[PDB]
Amino acid sequence: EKELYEKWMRTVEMLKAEGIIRSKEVERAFLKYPRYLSVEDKYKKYAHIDEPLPIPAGQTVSAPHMVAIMLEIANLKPGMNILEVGTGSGWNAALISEIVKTDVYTIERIPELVEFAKRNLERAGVKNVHVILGDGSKGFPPKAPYDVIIVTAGAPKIPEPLIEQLKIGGKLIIPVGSYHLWQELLEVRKTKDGIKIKNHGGVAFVPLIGEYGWK
Ligand SMILES: Nc1ncnc2c1ncn2[C@@H]1O[C@H](CO)[C@@H](O)[C@H]1O
Ligand code: NA
């Protein structure tokens, strides 16, 4: 326990020292919710290593540095209305909730993972994260519009529904690529002057499967 946390603290210090974690907000979220709380027992021993890890149903939880990079790009603030597409283990959602101090909506298409995430969240005492079973490539109309939409699965293109559901001045962070498993991390800003896109380099995420994702 405290041992796992000590290794985690070292990982957070490393991410901070190397300029990956750049804000006190993201630093605080990482320190409150260590990744070991979101993986199966057999992988907890590796939760501090900056590498992706497997989770149930053939999916994965991203490497700590990638989760940090995406949260920093999001420039999250308390009170924001955030939608995460691809709950997985629930780790990222927990982190987001610690930063925005309010209800966070996250969508997962695999029933087994919806259960897995809910259990992890409950065990960690999280209450503001709301896990919904469904096809997140269609976003989540009930609580739109969103300040930021963070997609943790790779798409073949930018899903229109996610753009429609963004507040003006908001942004969509999503991996887009012509390969199911190898993508480019895009920061899609919905500005008063139109869509502005910043490419943040190559990444490797599981595919976003759905009506507006991969078949
Ligand atoms: N259309 C989708 N909606 C919600 N979650 C999805 C979708 N496609 C893939 N995922 C999920 O993305 C998660 C990645 O963090 C995986 O657990 C995967 O099942
Ligand atoms: Na996660």
Side-chain angles (χ1 to χ4, degrees):
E1 51 293 297
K2 55 179 292 297
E3 184 179 302
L4 287 173
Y5 193 72
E6 290 188 0
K7 290 186 174 182
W8 181 243
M9 291 188 279
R10 196 284 181 290
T11 294
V12 177
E13 295 189 356
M14 173 278 283
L15 289 171
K16 184 197 304 178
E18 295 302 299
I20 306 308
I21 285 183
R22 317 170 170 215
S23 62
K24 68 175 188 299
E25 293 70 45
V26 173
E27 190 190 318
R28 289 175 176 176
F30 267 60
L31 295 171
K32 177 162 181 55
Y33 296 122
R35 181 166 72 156
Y36 65 69
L37 297 176
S38 300
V39 300
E40 302 167 76
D41 296 322
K42 61 173 173 296
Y43 298 121
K44 295 189 189 303
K45 69 175 72 67
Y46 301 130
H48 64 294
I49 302 300
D50 200 349
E51 75 184 323
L53 290 175
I55 54 172
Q59 309 307 119
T60 77
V61 55
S62 295
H65 81 278
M66 184 51 51
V67 172
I69 289 292
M70 291 170 77
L71 290 177
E72 292 290 3
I73 292 301
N75 198 19
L76 302 168
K77 301 294 179 183
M80 284 185 172
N81 187 45
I82 310 300
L83 173 66
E84 170 188 49
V85 174
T87 314
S89 69
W91 187 42
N92 194 41
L95 296 167
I96 297 169
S97 73
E98 180 50 42
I99 300 174
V100 302
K101 320 296 183 180
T102 187
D103 299 285
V104 175
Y105 297 99
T106 182
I107 321 169
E108 172 58 60
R109 69 179 287 276
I110 304 180
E112 171 174 17
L113 287 176
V114 164
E115 295 294 291
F116 183 62
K118 287 182 178 180
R119 299 297 151 59
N120 289 336
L121 293 164
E122 180 205 0
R123 187 183 308 106
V126 185
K127 183 80 167 58
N128 284 173
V129 174
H130 309 299
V131 187
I132 304 83
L133 168 68
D135 173 8
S137 72
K138 298 175 64 62
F140 187 56
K143 295 297 183 179
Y146 303 94
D147 289 83
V148 183
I149 294 175
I150 301 175
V151 184
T152 61
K157 59 185 170 58
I158 299 299
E160 173 56 25
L162 302 185
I163 296 177
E164 300 180 309
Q165 294 171 42
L166 277 177
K167 293 177 179 176
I168 297 298
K171 71 178 63 176
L172 162 68
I173 304 304
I174 179 174
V176 176
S178 293
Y179 286 84
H180 285 250
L181 298 158
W182 322 104
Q183 311 91 5
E184 174 75 26
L185 181 62
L186 307 187
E187 173 185 353
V188 187
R189 301 180 181 186
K190 187 178 181 181
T191 78
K192 291 58 57 186
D193 302 306
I195 293 180
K196 304 297 179 186
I197 303 173
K198 292 185 178 182
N199 296 181
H200 290 273
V203 293
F205 289 77
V206 295
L208 177 70
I209 305 300
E211 192 182 312
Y212 293 80
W214 294 99
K215 289 190 175 184

PDB file of all heavy atoms in Angstrom, residues 122-157:
ATOM      1  N   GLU A 122     -16.038   3.259  -6.978  1.00  0.00           N
ATOM      2  CA  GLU A 122     -16.683   3.117  -5.680  1.00  0.00           C
ATOM      3  C   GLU A 122     -15.657   2.777  -4.603  1.00  0.00           C
ATOM      4  O   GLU A 122     -15.683   3.341  -3.510  1.00  0.00           O
ATOM      5  CB  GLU A 122     -17.745   2.020  -5.719  1.00  0.00           C
ATOM      6  CG  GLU A 122     -18.454   1.846  -4.382  1.00  0.00           C
ATOM      7  CD  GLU A 122     -19.031   0.461  -4.198  1.00  0.00           C
ATOM      8  OE1 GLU A 122     -18.889  -0.376  -5.112  1.00  0.00           O
ATOM      9  OE2 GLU A 122     -19.623   0.209  -3.129  1.00  0.00           O
ATOM     10  N   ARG A 123     -14.753   1.853  -4.915  1.00  0.00           N
ATOM     11  CA  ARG A 123     -13.728   1.444  -3.961  1.00  0.00           C
ATOM     12  C   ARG A 123     -12.831   2.612  -3.561  1.00  0.00           C
ATOM     13  O   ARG A 123     -12.373   2.686  -2.419  1.00  0.00           O
ATOM     14  CB  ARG A 123     -12.865   0.323  -4.552  1.00  0.00           C
ATOM     15  CG  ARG A 123     -11.886  -0.282  -3.555  1.00  0.00           C
ATOM     16  CD  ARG A 123     -10.989  -1.332  -4.197  1.00  0.00           C
ATOM     17  NE  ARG A 123     -11.755  -2.339  -4.928  1.00  0.00           N
ATOM     18  CZ  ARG A 123     -11.829  -2.403  -6.254  1.00  0.00           C
ATOM     19  NH1 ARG A 123     -11.180  -1.519  -7.002  1.00  0.00           N
ATOM     20  NH2 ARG A 123     -12.560  -3.346  -6.834  1.00  0.00           N
ATOM     21  N   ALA A 124     -12.587   3.523  -4.500  1.00  0.00           N
ATOM     22  CA  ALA A 124     -11.739   4.685  -4.247  1.00  0.00           C
ATOM     23  C   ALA A 124     -12.498   5.860  -3.630  1.00  0.00           C
ATOM     24  O   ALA A 124     -11.916   6.919  -3.385  1.00  0.00           O
ATOM     25  CB  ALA A 124     -11.065   5.126  -5.539  1.00  0.00           C
ATOM     26  N   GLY A 125     -13.794   5.674  -3.397  1.00  0.00           N
ATOM     27  CA  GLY A 125     -14.599   6.719  -2.786  1.00  0.00           C
ATOM     28  C   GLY A 125     -15.037   7.850  -3.697  1.00  0.00           C
ATOM     29  O   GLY A 125     -15.450   8.908  -3.219  1.00  0.00           O
ATOM     30  N   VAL A 126     -14.948   7.636  -5.007  1.00  0.00           N
ATOM     31  CA  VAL A 126     -15.348   8.658  -5.970  1.00  0.00           C
ATOM     32  C   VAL A 126     -16.872   8.630  -6.102  1.00  0.00           C
ATOM     33  O   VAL A 126     -17.480   7.560  -6.146  1.00  0.00           O
ATOM     34  CB  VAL A 126     -14.698   8.405  -7.354  1.00  0.00           C
ATOM     35  CG1 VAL A 126     -15.037   9.544  -8.308  1.00  0.00           C
ATOM     36  CG2 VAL A 126     -13.188   8.269  -7.201  1.00  0.00           C
ATOM     37  N   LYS A 127     -17.488   9.806  -6.150  1.00  0.00           N
ATOM     38  CA  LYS A 127     -18.939   9.893  -6.261  1.00  0.00           C
ATOM     39  C   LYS A 127     -19.384  10.746  -7.452  1.00  0.00           C
ATOM     40  O   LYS A 127     -20.471  10.541  -7.992  1.00  0.00           O
ATOM     41  CB  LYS A 127     -19.519  10.471  -4.962  1.00  0.00           C
ATOM     42  CG  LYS A 127     -21.046  10.563  -4.895  1.00  0.00           C
ATOM     43  CD  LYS A 127     -21.687   9.225  -4.548  1.00  0.00           C
ATOM     44  CE  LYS A 127     -23.159   9.387  -4.173  1.00  0.00           C
ATOM     45  NZ  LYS A 127     -23.961  10.015  -5.258  1.00  0.00           N
ATOM     46  N   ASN A 128     -18.540  11.689  -7.867  1.00  0.00           N
ATOM     47  CA  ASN A 128     -18.876  12.581  -8.978  1.00  0.00           C
ATOM     48  C   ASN A 128     -18.698  12.030 -10.388  1.00  0.00           C
ATOM     49  O   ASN A 128     -19.050  12.699 -11.362  1.00  0.00           O
ATOM     50  CB  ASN A 128     -18.092  13.887  -8.854  1.00  0.00           C
ATOM     51  CG  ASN A 128     -18.657  14.803  -7.793  1.00  0.00           C
ATOM     52  OD1 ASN A 128     -18.074  15.842  -7.480  1.00  0.00           O
ATOM     53  ND2 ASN A 128     -19.804  14.426  -7.235  1.00  0.00           N
ATOM     54  N   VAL A 129     -18.149  10.828 -10.515  1.00  0.00           N
ATOM     55  CA  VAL A 129     -17.965  10.243 -11.837  1.00  0.00           C
ATOM     56  C   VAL A 129     -19.173   9.391 -12.191  1.00  0.00           C
ATOM     57  O   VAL A 129     -19.595   8.537 -11.410  1.00  0.00           O
ATOM     58  CB  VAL A 129     -16.685   9.385 -11.907  1.00  0.00           C
ATOM     59  CG1 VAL A 129     -16.598   8.677 -13.256  1.00  0.00           C
ATOM     60  CG2 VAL A 129     -15.468  10.272 -11.703  1.00  0.00           C
ATOM     61  N   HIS A 130     -19.730   9.645 -13.369  1.00  0.00           N
ATOM     62  CA  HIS A 130     -20.902   8.919 -13.834  1.00  0.00           C
ATOM     63  C   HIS A 130     -20.559   8.136 -15.083  1.00  0.00           C
ATOM     64  O   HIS A 130     -20.294   8.712 -16.142  1.00  0.00           O
ATOM     65  CB  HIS A 130     -22.030   9.910 -14.100  1.00  0.00           C
ATOM     66  CG  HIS A 130     -22.283  10.827 -12.948  1.00  0.00           C
ATOM     67  ND1 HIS A 130     -22.671  10.368 -11.707  1.00  0.00           N
ATOM     68  CD2 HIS A 130     -22.119  12.166 -12.819  1.00  0.00           C
ATOM     69  CE1 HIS A 130     -22.729  11.382 -10.863  1.00  0.00           C
ATOM     70  NE2 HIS A 130     -22.397  12.483 -11.512  1.00  0.00           N
ATOM     71  N   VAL A 131     -20.558   6.816 -14.939  1.00  0.00           N
ATOM     72  CA  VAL A 131     -20.226   5.918 -16.033  1.00  0.00           C
ATOM     73  C   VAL A 131     -21.485   5.484 -16.761  1.00  0.00           C
ATOM     74  O   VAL A 131     -22.420   4.961 -16.147  1.00  0.00           O
ATOM     75  CB  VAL A 131     -19.488   4.669 -15.513  1.00  0.00           C
ATOM     76  CG1 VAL A 131     -19.013   3.831 -16.684  1.00  0.00           C
ATOM     77  CG2 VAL A 131     -18.317   5.087 -14.635  1.00  0.00           C
ATOM     78  N   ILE A 132     -21.500   5.702 -18.073  1.00  0.00           N
ATOM     79  CA  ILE A 132     -22.646   5.357 -18.902  1.00  0.00           C
ATOM     80  C   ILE A 132     -22.267   4.318 -19.949  1.00  0.00           C
ATOM     81  O   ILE A 132     -21.231   4.434 -20.606  1.00  0.00           O
ATOM     82  CB  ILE A 132     -23.211   6.601 -19.645  1.00  0.00           C
ATOM     83  CG1 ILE A 132     -23.562   7.711 -18.651  1.00  0.00           C
ATOM     84  CG2 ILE A 132     -24.462   6.215 -20.437  1.00  0.00           C
ATOM     85  CD1 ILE A 132     -22.391   8.567 -18.243  1.00  0.00           C
ATOM     86  N   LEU A 133     -23.104   3.295 -20.095  1.00  0.00           N
ATOM     87  CA  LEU A 133     -22.872   2.255 -21.092  1.00  0.00           C
ATOM     88  C   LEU A 133     -23.416   2.737 -22.427  1.00  0.00           C
ATOM     89  O   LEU A 133     -24.601   3.064 -22.540  1.00  0.00           O
ATOM     90  CB  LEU A 133     -23.589   0.958 -20.702  1.00  0.00           C
ATOM     91  CG  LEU A 133     -23.655  -0.104 -21.805  1.00  0.00           C
ATOM     92  CD1 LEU A 133     -22.266  -0.644 -22.102  1.00  0.00           C
ATOM     93  CD2 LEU A 133     -24.575  -1.237 -21.360  1.00  0.00           C
ATOM     94  N   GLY A 134     -22.561   2.788 -23.439  1.00  0.00           N
ATOM     95  CA  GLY A 134     -23.025   3.233 -24.739  1.00  0.00           C
ATOM     96  C   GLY A 134     -21.927   3.491 -25.748  1.00  0.00           C
ATOM     97  O   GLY A 134     -20.752   3.214 -25.502  1.00  0.00           O
ATOM     98  N   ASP A 135     -22.337   4.010 -26.899  1.00  0.00           N
ATOM     99  CA  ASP A 135     -21.434   4.340 -27.993  1.00  0.00           C
ATOM    100  C   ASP A 135     -21.098   5.823 -27.890  1.00  0.00           C
ATOM    101  O   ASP A 135     -21.863   6.677 -28.344  1.00  0.00           O
ATOM    102  CB  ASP A 135     -22.114   4.032 -29.332  1.00  0.00           C
ATOM    103  CG  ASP A 135     -21.312   4.513 -30.527  1.00  0.00           C
ATOM    104  OD1 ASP A 135     -20.158   4.944 -30.343  1.00  0.00           O
ATOM    105  OD2 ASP A 135     -21.836   4.452 -31.659  1.00  0.00           O
ATOM    106  N   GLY A 136     -19.945   6.109 -27.289  1.00  0.00           N
ATOM    107  CA  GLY A 136     -19.498   7.478 -27.099  1.00  0.00           C
ATOM    108  C   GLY A 136     -19.097   8.257 -28.340  1.00  0.00           C
ATOM    109  O   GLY A 136     -18.838   9.457 -28.242  1.00  0.00           O
ATOM    110  N   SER A 137     -19.016   7.603 -29.496  1.00  0.00           N
ATOM    111  CA  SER A 137     -18.671   8.321 -30.720  1.00  0.00           C
ATOM    112  C   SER A 137     -19.862   9.217 -31.063  1.00  0.00           C
ATOM    113  O   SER A 137     -19.768  10.104 -31.910  1.00  0.00           O
ATOM    114  CB  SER A 137     -18.377   7.352 -31.877  1.00  0.00           C
ATOM    115  OG  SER A 137     -19.552   6.724 -32.362  1.00  0.00           O
ATOM    116  N   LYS A 138     -20.982   8.968 -30.386  1.00  0.00           N
ATOM    117  CA  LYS A 138     -22.201   9.751 -30.565  1.00  0.00           C
ATOM    118  C   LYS A 138     -22.277  10.781 -29.444  1.00  0.00           C
ATOM    119  O   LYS A 138     -23.270  11.486 -29.305  1.00  0.00           O
ATOM    120  CB  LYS A 138     -23.440   8.853 -30.498  1.00  0.00           C
ATOM    121  CG  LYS A 138     -23.516   7.792 -31.577  1.00  0.00           C
ATOM    122  CD  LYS A 138     -24.708   6.863 -31.357  1.00  0.00           C
ATOM    123  CE  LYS A 138     -26.038   7.605 -31.470  1.00  0.00           C
ATOM    124  NZ  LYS A 138     -26.242   8.177 -32.832  1.00  0.00           N
ATOM    125  N   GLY A 139     -21.221  10.852 -28.640  1.00  0.00           N
ATOM    126  CA  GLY A 139     -21.200  11.791 -27.533  1.00  0.00           C
ATOM    127  C   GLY A 139     -22.213  11.390 -26.480  1.00  0.00           C
ATOM    128  O   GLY A 139     -22.472  10.200 -26.281  1.00  0.00           O
ATOM    129  N   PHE A 140     -22.778  12.385 -25.804  1.00  0.00           N
ATOM    130  CA  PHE A 140     -23.782  12.163 -24.770  1.00  0.00           C
ATOM    131  C   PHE A 140     -24.650  13.420 -24.691  1.00  0.00           C
ATOM    132  O   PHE A 140     -24.444  14.293 -23.844  1.00  0.00           O
ATOM    133  CB  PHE A 140     -23.105  11.885 -23.422  1.00  0.00           C
ATOM    134  CG  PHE A 140     -24.065  11.492 -22.334  1.00  0.00           C
ATOM    135  CD1 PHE A 140     -24.915  10.406 -22.501  1.00  0.00           C
ATOM    136  CD2 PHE A 140     -24.129  12.214 -21.151  1.00  0.00           C
ATOM    137  CE1 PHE A 140     -25.819  10.046 -21.498  1.00  0.00           C
ATOM    138  CE2 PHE A 140     -25.029  11.861 -20.144  1.00  0.00           C
ATOM    139  CZ  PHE A 140     -25.872  10.778 -20.320  1.00  0.00           C
ATOM    140  N   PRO A 141     -25.638  13.525 -25.593  1.00  0.00           N
ATOM    141  CA  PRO A 141     -26.569  14.652 -25.688  1.00  0.00           C
ATOM    142  C   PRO A 141     -27.217  15.155 -24.398  1.00  0.00           C
ATOM    143  O   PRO A 141     -27.304  16.364 -24.178  1.00  0.00           O
ATOM    144  CB  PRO A 141     -27.606  14.154 -26.693  1.00  0.00           C
ATOM    145  CG  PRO A 141     -26.786  13.296 -27.604  1.00  0.00           C
ATOM    146  CD  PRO A 141     -25.948  12.512 -26.619  1.00  0.00           C
ATOM    147  N   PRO A 142     -27.667  14.241 -23.521  1.00  0.00           N
ATOM    148  CA  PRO A 142     -28.308  14.655 -22.270  1.00  0.00           C
ATOM    149  C   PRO A 142     -27.613  15.743 -21.457  1.00  0.00           C
ATOM    150  O   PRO A 142     -28.279  16.592 -20.866  1.00  0.00           O
ATOM    151  CB  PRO A 142     -28.430  13.340 -21.500  1.00  0.00           C
ATOM    152  CG  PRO A 142     -28.673  12.357 -22.591  1.00  0.00           C
ATOM    153  CD  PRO A 142     -27.632  12.771 -23.620  1.00  0.00           C
ATOM    154  N   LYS A 143     -26.284  15.722 -21.418  1.00  0.00           N
ATOM    155  CA  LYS A 143     -25.553  16.713 -20.642  1.00  0.00           C
ATOM    156  C   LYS A 143     -24.703  17.678 -21.465  1.00  0.00           C
ATOM    157  O   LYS A 143     -23.877  18.399 -20.911  1.00  0.00           O
ATOM    158  CB  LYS A 143     -24.678  16.019 -19.595  1.00  0.00           C
ATOM    159  CG  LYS A 143     -25.463  15.265 -18.525  1.00  0.00           C
ATOM    160  CD  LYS A 143     -26.322  16.198 -17.689  1.00  0.00           C
ATOM    161  CE  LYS A 143     -27.049  15.433 -16.588  1.00  0.00           C
ATOM    162  NZ  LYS A 143     -27.889  16.332 -15.742  1.00  0.00           N
ATOM    163  N   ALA A 144     -24.908  17.694 -22.778  1.00  0.00           N
ATOM    164  CA  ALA A 144     -24.171  18.615 -23.644  1.00  0.00           C
ATOM    165  C   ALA A 144     -24.737  20.022 -23.415  1.00  0.00           C
ATOM    166  O   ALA A 144     -25.862  20.170 -22.936  1.00  0.00           O
ATOM    167  CB  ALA A 144     -24.347  18.210 -25.099  1.00  0.00           C
ATOM    168  N   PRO A 145     -23.970  21.075 -23.753  1.00  0.00           N
ATOM    169  CA  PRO A 145     -22.622  21.083 -24.329  1.00  0.00           C
ATOM    170  C   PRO A 145     -21.517  20.967 -23.281  1.00  0.00           C
ATOM    171  O   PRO A 145     -21.720  21.263 -22.102  1.00  0.00           O
ATOM    172  CB  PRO A 145     -22.581  22.415 -25.066  1.00  0.00           C
ATOM    173  CG  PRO A 145     -23.320  23.292 -24.127  1.00  0.00           C
ATOM    174  CD  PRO A 145     -24.525  22.441 -23.744  1.00  0.00           C
ATOM    175  N   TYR A 146     -20.337  20.558 -23.735  1.00  0.00           N
ATOM    176  CA  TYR A 146     -19.195  20.353 -22.856  1.00  0.00           C
ATOM    177  C   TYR A 146     -18.045  21.337 -23.065  1.00  0.00           C
ATOM    178  O   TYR A 146     -17.834  21.825 -24.176  1.00  0.00           O
ATOM    179  CB  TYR A 146     -18.672  18.925 -23.047  1.00  0.00           C
ATOM    180  CG  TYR A 146     -19.713  17.855 -22.804  1.00  0.00           C
ATOM    181  CD1 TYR A 146     -20.462  17.317 -23.852  1.00  0.00           C
ATOM    182  CD2 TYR A 146     -19.970  17.400 -21.513  1.00  0.00           C
ATOM    183  CE1 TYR A 146     -21.444  16.351 -23.614  1.00  0.00           C
ATOM    184  CE2 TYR A 146     -20.946  16.444 -21.267  1.00  0.00           C
ATOM    185  CZ  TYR A 146     -21.675  15.925 -22.314  1.00  0.00           C
ATOM    186  OH  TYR A 146     -22.638  14.981 -22.049  1.00  0.00           O
ATOM    187  N   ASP A 147     -17.311  21.624 -21.992  1.00  0.00           N
ATOM    188  CA  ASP A 147     -16.158  22.514 -22.078  1.00  0.00           C
ATOM    189  C   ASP A 147     -15.030  21.768 -22.783  1.00  0.00           C
ATOM    190  O   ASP A 147     -14.295  22.336 -23.592  1.00  0.00           O
ATOM    191  CB  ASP A 147     -15.676  22.930 -20.684  1.00  0.00           C
ATOM    192  CG  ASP A 147     -16.632  23.879 -19.995  1.00  0.00           C
ATOM    193  OD1 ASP A 147     -17.621  23.408 -19.393  1.00  0.00           O
ATOM    194  OD2 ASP A 147     -16.389  25.104 -20.063  1.00  0.00           O
ATOM    195  N   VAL A 148     -14.889  20.487 -22.458  1.00  0.00           N
ATOM    196  CA  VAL A 148     -13.859  19.655 -23.063  1.00  0.00           C
ATOM    197  C   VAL A 148     -14.380  18.237 -23.197  1.00  0.00           C
ATOM    198  O   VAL A 148     -15.133  17.764 -22.349  1.00  0.00           O
ATOM    199  CB  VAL A 148     -12.568  19.608 -22.207  1.00  0.00           C
ATOM    200  CG1 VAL A 148     -11.493  18.794 -22.926  1.00  0.00           C
ATOM    201  CG2 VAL A 148     -12.053  21.021 -21.944  1.00  0.00           C
ATOM    202  N   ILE A 149     -13.996  17.581 -24.285  1.00  0.00           N
ATOM    203  CA  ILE A 149     -14.369  16.194 -24.524  1.00  0.00           C
ATOM    204  C   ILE A 149     -13.029  15.499 -24.729  1.00  0.00           C
ATOM    205  O   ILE A 149     -12.249  15.881 -25.604  1.00  0.00           O
ATOM    206  CB  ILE A 149     -15.251  16.034 -25.779  1.00  0.00           C
ATOM    207  CG1 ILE A 149     -16.597  16.727 -25.549  1.00  0.00           C
ATOM    208  CG2 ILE A 149     -15.454  14.551 -26.074  1.00  0.00           C
ATOM    209  CD1 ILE A 149     -17.512  16.732 -26.749  1.00  0.00           C
ATOM    210  N   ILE A 150     -12.749  14.510 -23.889  1.00  0.00           N
ATOM    211  CA  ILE A 150     -11.499  13.774 -23.967  1.00  0.00           C
ATOM    212  C   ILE A 150     -11.804  12.356 -24.428  1.00  0.00           C
ATOM    213  O   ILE A 150     -12.528  11.622 -23.754  1.00  0.00           O
ATOM    214  CB  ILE A 150     -10.807  13.756 -22.589  1.00  0.00           C
ATOM    215  CG1 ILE A 150     -10.538  15.198 -22.141  1.00  0.00           C
ATOM    216  CG2 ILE A 150      -9.518  12.950 -22.659  1.00  0.00           C
ATOM    217  CD1 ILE A 150      -9.956  15.329 -20.744  1.00  0.00           C
ATOM    218  N   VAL A 151     -11.257  11.986 -25.583  1.00  0.00           N
ATOM    219  CA  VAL A 151     -11.490  10.665 -26.170  1.00  0.00           C
ATOM    220  C   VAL A 151     -10.230   9.821 -25.991  1.00  0.00           C
ATOM    221  O   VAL A 151      -9.142  10.220 -26.397  1.00  0.00           O
ATOM    222  CB  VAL A 151     -11.846  10.812 -27.664  1.00  0.00           C
ATOM    223  CG1 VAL A 151     -12.199   9.460 -28.261  1.00  0.00           C
ATOM    224  CG2 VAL A 151     -13.015  11.778 -27.817  1.00  0.00           C
ATOM    225  N   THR A 152     -10.387   8.645 -25.388  1.00  0.00           N
ATOM    226  CA  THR A 152      -9.246   7.779 -25.097  1.00  0.00           C
ATOM    227  C   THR A 152      -9.155   6.533 -25.969  1.00  0.00           C
ATOM    228  O   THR A 152      -8.538   5.532 -25.583  1.00  0.00           O
ATOM    229  CB  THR A 152      -9.274   7.361 -23.621  1.00  0.00           C
ATOM    230  OG1 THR A 152     -10.482   6.641 -23.361  1.00  0.00           O
ATOM    231  CG2 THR A 152      -9.230   8.588 -22.726  1.00  0.00           C
ATOM    232  N   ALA A 153      -9.773   6.601 -27.142  1.00  0.00           N
ATOM    233  CA  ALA A 153      -9.756   5.507 -28.106  1.00  0.00           C
ATOM    234  C   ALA A 153      -9.571   6.173 -29.469  1.00  0.00           C
ATOM    235  O   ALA A 153     -10.106   7.260 -29.701  1.00  0.00           O
ATOM    236  CB  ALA A 153     -11.073   4.728 -28.051  1.00  0.00           C
ATOM    237  N   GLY A 154      -8.813   5.531 -30.354  1.00  0.00           N
ATOM    238  CA  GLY A 154      -8.545   6.095 -31.670  1.00  0.00           C
ATOM    239  C   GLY A 154      -9.650   6.002 -32.704  1.00  0.00           C
ATOM    240  O   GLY A 154     -10.237   4.937 -32.914  1.00  0.00           O
ATOM    241  N   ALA A 155      -9.922   7.124 -33.367  1.00  0.00           N
ATOM    242  CA  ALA A 155     -10.962   7.191 -34.386  1.00  0.00           C
ATOM    243  C   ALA A 155     -10.363   7.363 -35.779  1.00  0.00           C
ATOM    244  O   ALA A 155      -9.211   7.768 -35.925  1.00  0.00           O
ATOM    245  CB  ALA A 155     -11.904   8.351 -34.094  1.00  0.00           C
ATOM    246  N   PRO A 156     -11.140   7.041 -36.823  1.00  0.00           N
ATOM    247  CA  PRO A 156     -10.660   7.180 -38.200  1.00  0.00           C
ATOM    248  C   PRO A 156     -10.831   8.618 -38.680  1.00  0.00           C
ATOM    249  O   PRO A 156     -10.265   9.018 -39.699  1.00  0.00           O
ATOM    250  CB  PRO A 156     -11.533   6.192 -38.969  1.00  0.00           C
ATOM    251  CG  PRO A 156     -12.833   6.243 -38.227  1.00  0.00           C
ATOM    252  CD  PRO A 156     -12.398   6.269 -36.772  1.00  0.00           C
ATOM    253  N   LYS A 157     -11.609   9.391 -37.928  1.00  0.00           N
ATOM    254  CA  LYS A 157     -11.881  10.791 -38.253  1.00  0.00           C
ATOM    255  C   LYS A 157     -12.413  11.504 -37.016  1.00  0.00           C
ATOM    256  O   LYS A 157     -12.557  10.894 -35.959  1.00  0.00           O
ATOM    257  CB  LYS A 157     -12.930  10.865 -39.364  1.00  0.00           C
ATOM    258  CG  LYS A 157     -14.242  10.195 -38.986  1.00  0.00           C
ATOM    259  CD  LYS A 157     -15.213  10.172 -40.155  1.00  0.00           C
ATOM    260  CE  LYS A 157     -16.421   9.300 -39.852  1.00  0.00           C
ATOM    261  NZ  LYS A 157     -17.133   9.758 -38.636  1.00  0.00           N
TER     262      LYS A 157
END
